[PDB]
Design a protein around this ligand. Structure first.
Ligand SMILES: Clc1ccc(-c2nnc([C@H]3CCNC3)o2)cc1
Ligand SMILES: Clc1ccc(-c2nnc([C@H]3CCNC3)o2)cc1
Ligand SMILES: Clc1ccc(-c2nnc([C@H]3CCNC3)o2)cc1
Length: 341
């Protein structure tokens, strides 16, 4: 079936992941080693801030999570998943975690800063991506899932806001807050409504097939400019998702429609990526006939566009948020819950 070079690559990738997975790094910097520059984005339990390391001058994106808000939102296991996975993975299209640490109030994950901004911004600015442009990004996600799934990891948060565009025009995936190592099935209701597979919505035990469904949603959104299932109320979105009905814009190629019908298959036992040939059904589909998979992996293909930015500390591709304190309490909070962080 697969070439021995590919099998050996993935076998070594798993060996290296498991060594770090079984002995995670902890406490590799502290807050006063950095200067704060700007808030790059916010969220329910945390935010991401551009920082500069005071000794080296290097820029980083620091994700800050409030321990008490994490406990209240029942995200303890998820935050521990995120840091433990990020410190163990290594792949060209994943954001690199450089440091992690905690204090009395917060958990900190310090990643290399990617100045080009989120794919979401670029997609909304241009309207929609041409099929070659969408296919260049989709190929990178296919390889990333091939890697992650071979490590028994499910990603569970694919969407344009989590795909950063780097200085070469390639993707780096960020936010592993829903990622998890899974042996067979898992059961948590999590994700963004527009991207949820039917089996998540229906409260079933599910597997890596949910990532391949989300790839179908992403490719549709890149090529159309909007996602296939949307509405004002989540329950209305869920009803569309489970119905098995998708309408395609007339400008979609026949090959694109065919691939999407096989990724957006409501029956998970019939969905591309989850059949006997696994990822190969996707890589060998006609829509990818022009893709040089090794060249993509090696970053040898010229990108469709390079983001405009002035230097490693430029924030122009991210937007403006109210600047709030990073307060650290005099007393430790939730120490027992986060001992492993
Ligand atoms: Cl997901 C993924 C699966 C397999 C490979 C792979 N198989 N052989 C290689 C060689 C050629 C380039 N340098 C190592 O890479 C890469 C990514
Ligand atoms: Cl409610 C709950 C459900 C599952 C787990 C769990 N699954 N694997 C683990 C590892 C890492 C931390 N300790 C052992 O914990 C913890 C709490
Ligand atoms: Cl390297 C890097 C640079 C920026 C970010 C980032 N900025 N905002 C976010 C959140 C909120 C919206 N989407 C996820 O993440 C993460 C990593």
């Amino acid at each position: 079936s697969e070439q021995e070079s590919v099998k050996e690559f993935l076998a070594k990738a798993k060996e290296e992941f498991l060594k770090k997975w079984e002995s995670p790094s902890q406490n590799t910097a502290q807050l006063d080693h950095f200067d704060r520059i700007k808030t790059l984005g916010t969220g329910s339990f945390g935010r991401v801030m551009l920082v500069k390391h005071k000794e080296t001058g290097n820029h980083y994106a620091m994700k800050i999570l409030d321990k008490q808000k994490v406990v209240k939102l029942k995200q303890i296991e998820h935050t521990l998943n995120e840091k433990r996975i990020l410190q163990a993975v290594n792949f060209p299209f994943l954001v690199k975690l450089e440091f992690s640490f905690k204090d009395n109030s917060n958990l900190y994950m310090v990643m290399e800063y990617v100045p080009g901004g989120e794919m979401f911004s670029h997609l909304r600015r241009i309207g929609r991506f041409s099929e070659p442009h969408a296919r260049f990004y989709a190929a990178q996600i296919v390889l990333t899932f091939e890697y992650l799934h071979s490590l028994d990891l499910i990603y569970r948060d694919l969407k344009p806001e989590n795909l950063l565009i780097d200085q070469q025009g390639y993707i780096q995936v960020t936010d592993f807050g829903f990622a998890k190592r899974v042996k067979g099935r898992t059961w948590t209701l999590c994700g963004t409504p527009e991207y949820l597979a039917p089996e998540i919505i229906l409260s079933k035990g599910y597997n890596k097939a949910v990532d391949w469904w989300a790839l179908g949603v992403l490719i549709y959104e890149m090529a159309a400019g909007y996602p296939p299932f949307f509405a004002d109320q989540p329950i209305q979105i869920y009803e569309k998702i489970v119905s098995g009905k998708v309408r395609f814009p007339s400008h979609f190629s026949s090959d694109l429609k065919d691939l999407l019908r096989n990724l957006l298959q409501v029956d998970l036992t019939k969905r591309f990526g989850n059949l006997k040939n696994g990822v190969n059904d996707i890589k060998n589909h006609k829509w990818f006939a022009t893709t040089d998979w090794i060249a993509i992996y090696q970053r040898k293909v010229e990108a469709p566009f390079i983001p405009k930015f002035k230097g490693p500390g430029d924030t122009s591709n991210f937007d403006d948020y109210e600047e709030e304190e990073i307060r650290v309490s005099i007393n430790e909070k939730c120490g027992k819950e986060f001992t492993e962080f």
